[PDB]
Amino acid sequence: PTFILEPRSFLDKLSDYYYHADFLSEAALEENPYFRLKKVVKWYLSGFYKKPKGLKKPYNPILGETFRCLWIHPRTNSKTFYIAEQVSHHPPISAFYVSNRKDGFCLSGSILAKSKFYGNSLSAILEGEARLTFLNRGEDYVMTMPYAHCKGILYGTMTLELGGTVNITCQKTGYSAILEFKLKPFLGSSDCVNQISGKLKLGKEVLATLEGHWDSEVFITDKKTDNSEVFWNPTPDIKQWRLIRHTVKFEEQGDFESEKLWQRVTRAINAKDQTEATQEKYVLEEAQRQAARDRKTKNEEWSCKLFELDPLTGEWHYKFADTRPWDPLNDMIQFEKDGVIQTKVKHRT
Protein backbone atom coordinates (compact mmCIF):
# COMPACT_ATOMS: atom_id res chain seq x y z
CA PRO A 1 0.00 0.00 0.00
CA THR A 2 0.94 3.66 -0.49
CA PHE A 3 -1.91 5.49 1.27
CA ILE A 4 0.66 5.24 4.09
CA LEU A 5 2.65 8.27 2.93
CA GLU A 6 3.70 11.47 4.67
CA PRO A 7 4.23 14.50 2.31
CA ARG A 8 7.81 14.99 3.58
CA SER A 9 11.17 13.74 2.34
CA PHE A 10 13.23 11.52 4.62
CA LEU A 11 15.86 14.25 4.66
CA ASP A 12 13.12 16.61 5.88
CA LYS A 13 11.91 14.23 8.59
CA LEU A 14 15.53 13.66 9.64
CA SER A 15 15.80 17.31 10.77
CA ASP A 16 12.94 17.04 13.29
CA TYR A 17 15.35 16.08 16.10
CA TYR A 18 16.81 19.61 16.38
CA TYR A 19 13.66 21.60 17.19
CA HIS A 20 14.97 21.63 20.79
CA ALA A 21 18.61 22.52 19.97
CA ASP A 22 17.95 25.10 22.68
CA PHE A 23 18.84 22.27 25.08
CA LEU A 24 22.17 21.48 23.40
CA SER A 25 23.37 25.06 23.85
CA GLU A 26 22.61 24.68 27.56
CA ALA A 27 24.47 21.36 27.70
CA ALA A 28 27.56 22.90 26.11
CA LEU A 29 27.73 25.36 29.02
CA GLU A 30 27.03 22.85 31.81
CA GLU A 31 30.36 22.32 33.56
CA ASN A 32 29.50 19.16 35.51
CA PRO A 33 30.28 16.11 33.32
CA TYR A 34 27.35 14.17 34.80
CA PHE A 35 24.85 16.99 34.22
CA ARG A 36 25.97 17.32 30.59
CA LEU A 37 24.98 13.68 29.92
CA LYS A 38 21.64 14.34 31.62
CA LYS A 39 20.99 17.35 29.38
CA VAL A 40 22.24 15.58 26.24
CA VAL A 41 19.89 12.67 26.96
CA LYS A 42 17.04 15.05 27.80
CA TRP A 43 17.53 16.56 24.34
CA TYR A 44 17.58 13.10 22.73
CA LEU A 45 14.18 12.22 24.20
CA SER A 46 12.83 15.62 23.07
CA GLY A 47 12.89 14.61 19.39
CA PHE A 48 10.40 11.72 19.49
CA TYR A 49 7.17 13.17 20.89
CA LYS A 50 5.85 14.90 17.75
CA LYS A 51 6.14 11.58 15.85
CA PRO A 52 2.66 10.60 14.60
CA LYS A 53 1.44 7.01 14.52
CA GLY A 54 0.07 5.28 11.44
CA LEU A 55 0.39 6.33 7.81
CA LYS A 56 3.64 8.25 8.34
CA LYS A 57 6.05 7.09 5.62
CA PRO A 58 8.66 9.65 4.53
CA TYR A 59 9.64 9.69 0.87
CA ASN A 60 12.59 7.50 0.01
CA PRO A 61 14.88 10.36 -1.08
CA ILE A 62 16.44 10.41 -4.55
CA LEU A 63 20.17 10.26 -5.15
CA GLY A 64 21.51 13.80 -5.11
CA GLU A 65 18.49 15.06 -3.18
CA THR A 66 19.33 17.73 -0.61
CA PHE A 67 17.44 19.30 2.29
CA ARG A 68 18.59 22.52 3.94
CA CYS A 69 17.05 24.33 6.91
CA LEU A 70 17.72 26.60 9.86
CA TRP A 71 16.61 27.26 13.45
CA ILE A 72 16.70 30.44 15.54
CA HIS A 73 18.04 30.61 19.11
CA PRO A 74 16.70 33.82 20.73
CA ARG A 75 18.31 33.32 24.15
CA THR A 76 21.83 32.78 22.79
CA ASN A 77 21.22 34.95 19.70
CA SER A 78 22.46 32.31 17.27
CA LYS A 79 21.34 29.81 14.64
CA THR A 80 21.52 26.02 14.20
CA PHE A 81 22.09 24.98 10.58
CA TYR A 82 21.14 21.63 9.05
CA ILE A 83 22.24 20.18 5.71
CA ALA A 84 21.53 16.64 4.48
CA GLU A 85 22.20 14.88 1.18
CA GLN A 86 21.26 11.49 -0.24
CA VAL A 87 24.63 9.94 -1.09
CA SER A 88 23.41 6.52 -2.23
CA HIS A 89 20.04 5.12 -3.35
CA HIS A 90 21.34 1.52 -3.45
CA PRO A 91 22.06 1.32 -0.55
CA PRO A 92 19.64 4.01 0.77
CA ILE A 93 22.06 6.07 2.84
CA SER A 94 21.48 9.73 3.71
CA ALA A 95 24.14 11.88 5.37
CA PHE A 96 23.53 14.98 7.48
CA TYR A 97 25.49 17.73 9.19
CA VAL A 98 24.41 20.15 11.91
CA SER A 99 26.46 23.14 13.07
CA ASN A 100 25.97 25.94 15.60
CA ARG A 101 29.42 27.34 16.34
CA LYS A 102 28.33 30.32 18.45
CA ASP A 103 26.58 27.94 20.86
CA GLY A 104 29.46 25.48 20.65
CA PHE A 105 27.98 22.24 19.33
CA CYS A 106 27.61 20.31 16.09
CA LEU A 107 26.33 16.92 14.95
CA SER A 108 27.25 14.62 12.07
CA GLY A 109 26.11 11.21 10.94
CA SER A 110 24.91 8.87 8.23
CA ILE A 111 21.71 6.80 8.27
CA LEU A 112 21.07 3.57 6.31
CA ALA A 113 17.44 2.53 5.83
CA LYS A 114 16.47 -1.15 5.83
CA SER A 115 12.91 -2.48 6.02
CA LYS A 116 11.60 -5.94 6.88
CA PHE A 117 8.09 -7.12 6.01
CA TYR A 118 6.25 -9.49 8.34
CA GLY A 119 3.11 -9.36 6.20
CA ASN A 120 0.58 -7.42 8.26
CA SER A 121 3.36 -5.58 10.14
CA LEU A 122 6.36 -3.64 8.79
CA SER A 123 9.53 -2.66 10.64
CA ALA A 124 11.84 -0.01 9.16
CA ILE A 125 15.25 0.25 10.82
CA LEU A 126 17.61 3.24 10.86
CA GLU A 127 21.18 2.11 11.52
CA GLY A 128 24.06 4.54 11.85
CA GLU A 129 25.84 6.62 14.46
CA ALA A 130 25.31 10.30 15.20
CA ARG A 131 28.28 12.17 16.68
CA LEU A 132 27.47 15.15 18.90
CA THR A 133 30.55 17.31 19.52
CA PHE A 134 30.90 20.23 21.92
CA LEU A 135 33.49 22.39 20.17
CA ASN A 136 34.89 24.17 23.23
CA ARG A 137 35.31 20.91 25.16
CA GLY A 138 36.62 18.59 22.44
CA GLU A 139 34.08 16.11 23.77
CA ASP A 140 32.07 13.67 21.65
CA TYR A 141 28.79 11.82 22.18
CA VAL A 142 28.07 8.82 19.95
CA MET A 143 24.43 7.77 19.72
CA THR A 144 22.23 5.50 17.61
CA MET A 145 18.51 5.53 16.87
CA PRO A 146 15.65 3.08 17.42
CA TYR A 147 13.60 1.33 14.75
CA ALA A 148 9.92 1.90 13.97
CA HIS A 149 7.60 -1.11 14.19
CA CYS A 150 4.37 -0.64 12.22
CA LYS A 151 1.36 -2.91 12.71
CA GLY A 152 -2.03 -2.79 11.04
CA ILE A 153 -1.11 -2.36 7.37
CA LEU A 154 -3.64 -4.85 5.99
CA TYR A 155 -5.98 -5.42 8.95
CA GLY A 156 -6.18 -4.37 12.59
CA THR A 157 -5.47 -1.07 14.27
CA MET A 158 -2.84 0.99 12.43
CA THR A 159 -0.07 1.90 14.87
CA LEU A 160 3.58 2.97 14.97
CA GLU A 161 5.65 1.99 18.01
CA LEU A 162 9.33 2.65 18.74
CA GLY A 163 11.59 -0.16 19.91
CA GLY A 164 15.26 -0.95 20.32
CA THR A 165 18.25 -0.36 22.57
CA VAL A 166 20.09 2.94 22.03
CA ASN A 167 23.57 3.65 23.40
CA ILE A 168 24.62 7.24 24.11
CA THR A 169 28.35 7.08 24.85
CA CYS A 170 30.86 9.78 25.82
CA GLN A 171 34.40 8.42 26.07
CA LYS A 172 36.01 11.71 27.15
CA THR A 173 34.24 11.87 30.52
CA GLY A 174 33.48 8.15 30.76
CA TYR A 175 29.74 8.71 31.13
CA SER A 176 27.06 7.01 29.04
CA ALA A 177 23.36 6.21 29.06
CA ILE A 178 21.72 3.11 27.57
CA LEU A 179 18.08 3.53 26.51
CA GLU A 180 15.59 0.76 25.72
CA PHE A 181 12.46 1.40 23.66
CA LYS A 182 9.90 -1.24 24.61
CA LEU A 183 7.13 -2.42 22.30
CA LYS A 184 3.67 -3.29 23.55
CA PRO A 185 3.12 -6.99 24.38
CA PHE A 186 0.36 -9.24 23.07
CA LEU A 187 -1.80 -8.63 26.15
CA GLY A 188 -1.24 -4.87 26.10
CA SER A 189 -2.35 -2.25 28.60
CA SER A 190 -3.32 1.41 28.82
CA ASP A 191 0.37 2.05 29.60
CA CYS A 192 2.42 -0.50 27.69
CA VAL A 193 2.91 1.34 24.37
CA ASN A 194 5.70 3.89 23.93
CA GLN A 195 7.28 2.69 27.18
CA ILE A 196 10.88 3.87 27.51
CA SER A 197 13.39 2.69 30.11
CA GLY A 198 17.09 3.40 30.51
CA LYS A 199 19.97 3.95 32.89
CA LEU A 200 22.63 6.66 33.17
CA LYS A 201 26.01 5.24 34.20
CA LEU A 202 29.67 6.20 34.62
CA GLY A 203 32.16 3.59 33.49
CA LYS A 204 30.08 0.57 34.44
CA GLU A 205 28.55 1.87 37.69
CA VAL A 206 24.90 2.85 37.24
CA LEU A 207 24.38 6.32 38.72
CA ALA A 208 20.66 6.81 38.00
CA THR A 209 17.86 5.09 36.08
CA LEU A 210 15.04 6.26 33.80
CA GLU A 211 11.42 5.10 33.50
CA GLY A 212 8.42 6.41 31.60
CA HIS A 213 7.06 6.90 28.09
CA TRP A 214 8.96 8.76 25.39
CA ASP A 215 5.88 10.77 24.34
CA SER A 216 5.08 11.62 27.98
CA GLU A 217 6.67 11.95 31.41
CA VAL A 218 10.03 10.26 31.95
CA PHE A 219 11.20 9.80 35.54
CA ILE A 220 14.75 9.54 36.91
CA THR A 221 15.66 8.02 40.30
CA ASP A 222 19.14 8.29 41.86
CA LYS A 223 20.69 4.92 42.70
CA LYS A 224 22.21 6.55 45.82
CA THR A 225 19.14 8.39 47.16
CA ASP A 226 16.46 6.21 45.52
CA ASN A 227 14.52 9.47 45.14
CA SER A 228 12.42 9.91 42.00
CA GLU A 229 12.18 13.05 39.87
CA VAL A 230 10.78 14.14 36.51
CA PHE A 231 13.66 13.77 34.04
CA TRP A 232 11.75 15.01 30.99
CA ASN A 233 8.13 15.69 30.04
CA PRO A 234 6.94 17.57 26.92
CA THR A 235 4.98 20.22 28.78
CA PRO A 236 2.68 22.37 26.61
CA ASP A 237 4.86 25.28 27.71
CA ILE A 238 7.89 23.37 26.42
CA LYS A 239 5.96 22.56 23.23
CA GLN A 240 4.87 26.20 22.95
CA TRP A 241 8.55 27.13 22.54
CA ARG A 242 10.08 24.99 19.81
CA LEU A 243 12.76 26.80 17.83
CA ILE A 244 11.26 28.32 14.67
CA ARG A 245 12.55 26.54 11.60
CA HIS A 246 13.24 28.46 8.39
CA THR A 247 13.42 26.74 5.01
CA VAL A 248 14.85 28.07 1.77
CA LYS A 249 12.79 30.32 -0.48
CA PHE A 250 11.12 28.07 -3.03
CA GLU A 251 12.29 30.19 -5.96
CA GLU A 252 15.87 30.06 -4.62
CA GLN A 253 15.91 26.27 -4.22
CA GLY A 254 17.78 23.96 -6.54
CA ASP A 255 15.72 21.59 -8.63
CA PHE A 256 16.88 18.54 -6.63
CA GLU A 257 16.19 20.02 -3.21
CA SER A 258 13.51 18.20 -1.26
CA GLU A 259 10.66 20.72 -1.45
CA LYS A 260 11.04 21.57 -5.15
CA LEU A 261 11.76 17.97 -6.18
CA TRP A 262 8.68 16.42 -4.55
CA GLN A 263 6.27 19.34 -5.06
CA ARG A 264 3.95 17.47 -7.44
CA VAL A 265 4.07 14.29 -5.36
CA THR A 266 3.31 16.33 -2.24
CA ARG A 267 0.44 18.24 -3.86
CA ALA A 268 -1.22 14.98 -4.91
CA ILE A 269 -1.04 13.61 -1.35
CA ASN A 270 -2.40 16.83 0.15
CA ALA A 271 -5.16 16.82 -2.48
CA LYS A 272 -6.03 13.23 -1.43
CA ASP A 273 -5.48 12.06 -5.03
CA GLN A 274 -3.94 8.64 -4.40
CA THR A 275 -3.54 7.56 -8.03
CA GLU A 276 -1.68 10.70 -9.14
CA ALA A 277 0.55 10.58 -6.05
CA THR A 278 1.95 7.21 -7.14
CA GLN A 279 2.30 8.31 -10.77
CA GLU A 280 4.22 11.45 -9.81
CA LYS A 281 6.50 9.28 -7.65
CA TYR A 282 7.09 6.94 -10.59
CA VAL A 283 8.11 9.96 -12.68
CA LEU A 284 10.90 10.77 -10.22
CA GLU A 285 12.01 7.15 -9.72
CA GLU A 286 11.87 6.43 -13.45
CA ALA A 287 14.10 9.46 -14.01
CA GLN A 288 16.45 8.17 -11.30
CA ARG A 289 16.63 4.75 -12.97
CA GLN A 290 17.17 6.48 -16.32
CA ALA A 291 19.78 8.81 -14.83
CA ALA A 292 21.46 5.72 -13.37
CA ARG A 293 21.50 4.10 -16.81
CA ASP A 294 22.82 7.27 -18.47
CA ARG A 295 25.59 7.31 -15.85
CA LYS A 296 26.77 3.76 -16.56
CA THR A 297 26.66 4.42 -20.32
CA LYS A 298 29.74 6.67 -20.56
CA ASN A 299 31.12 7.40 -17.08
CA GLU A 300 29.62 5.93 -13.90
CA GLU A 301 31.04 8.38 -11.36
CA TRP A 302 28.57 10.19 -9.09
CA SER A 303 30.09 13.11 -7.18
CA CYS A 304 28.21 13.93 -3.98
CA LYS A 305 28.22 17.72 -3.94
CA LEU A 306 28.24 18.34 -0.17
CA PHE A 307 29.54 15.06 1.30
CA GLU A 308 32.47 12.75 0.65
CA LEU A 309 33.25 9.21 1.80
CA ASP A 310 36.38 8.69 3.87
CA PRO A 311 37.91 5.45 2.51
CA LEU A 312 39.86 4.62 5.67
CA THR A 313 36.96 4.85 8.12
CA GLY A 314 34.08 4.26 5.70
CA GLU A 315 32.14 7.14 7.28
CA TRP A 316 30.58 10.03 5.37
CA HIS A 317 32.03 13.47 6.12
CA TYR A 318 30.55 16.87 5.28
CA LYS A 319 32.92 18.53 2.82
CA PHE A 320 32.80 21.92 4.58
CA ALA A 321 32.72 20.83 8.23
CA ASP A 322 34.20 23.34 10.67
CA THR A 323 34.79 22.41 14.36
CA ARG A 324 36.88 25.40 15.47
CA PRO A 325 35.46 26.88 18.70
CA TRP A 326 33.74 30.24 18.45
CA ASP A 327 36.14 33.17 18.84
CA PRO A 328 34.24 36.38 19.70
CA LEU A 329 37.15 38.59 18.63
CA ASN A 330 37.30 36.86 15.22
CA ASP A 331 34.00 35.13 14.40
CA MET A 332 31.14 37.46 13.52
CA ILE A 333 28.25 35.56 11.93
CA GLN A 334 27.70 31.92 11.00
CA PHE A 335 25.60 31.58 7.85
CA GLU A 336 24.84 29.17 5.01
CA LYS A 337 24.94 29.65 1.22
CA ASP A 338 23.96 26.97 -1.32
CA GLY A 339 24.37 24.17 1.22
CA VAL A 340 27.74 25.48 2.45
CA ILE A 341 27.73 26.45 6.13
CA GLN A 342 30.18 29.30 6.68
CA THR A 343 31.26 31.93 9.20
CA LYS A 344 32.27 35.53 8.52
CA VAL A 345 35.54 36.27 10.32
CA LYS A 346 37.76 39.34 10.44
CA HIS A 347 40.91 37.16 10.21
CA ARG A 348 41.37 34.12 7.99
CA THR A 349 42.61 31.13 9.99
Numbering used by the authors: 426 to 774
Sentences from the paper on this structure:
Lipid transfer at membrane contact sites, such as the ER–plasma membrane contact site, is facilitated by oxysterol-binding protein (OSBP)-related proteins (ORPs). Most human ORP proteins contain an N-terminal pleckstrin homology (PH) domain and a C-terminal lipid transport domain. The PH domain recognizes and binds the target membrane, while the C-terminal transmembrane helix anchors ORP8 to the donor (ER) membrane. In the case of ORP8, the cargo lipid is phosphatidylserine (PS), which is synthesized in the ER but needs to be transported to the plasma membrane.
However, despite years of efforts, we have only been successful in elucidating the structure of unliganded ORD8. The structure was solved by molecular replacement using an AlphaFold model. The RMSD between the model and the refined crystal structure was 1.44 Å, and the structure fitted the 2mFo-DFc composite omit map well. The overall fold is reminiscent of a β-barrel composed of anti-parallel β-strands. Compared to the well-studied β-barrel structure, the GFP, the ORD8 domain is composed of more β-strands (19 in total), whereas GFP is composed of 11 β-strands. However, in the case of ORD8, in one side of this β-barrel, the β-strands are replaced by three α-helices. The fold is therefore actually a mixture of alpha and beta. This observation is consistent with the previously reported structures of ORP2 and ORP3 that exhibit similar fold with RMSDs at 5.27 Å and 5.32 Å, respectively. The structure also revealed a rather large cavity (its volume was estimated using spaceball to be approximately 1860 Å3) in the middle of the barrel. This cavity, consistently with the previously reported structure of Osh6, represents the lipid-binding site. The full-length (including the lid) ORD domain never produced any crystals.
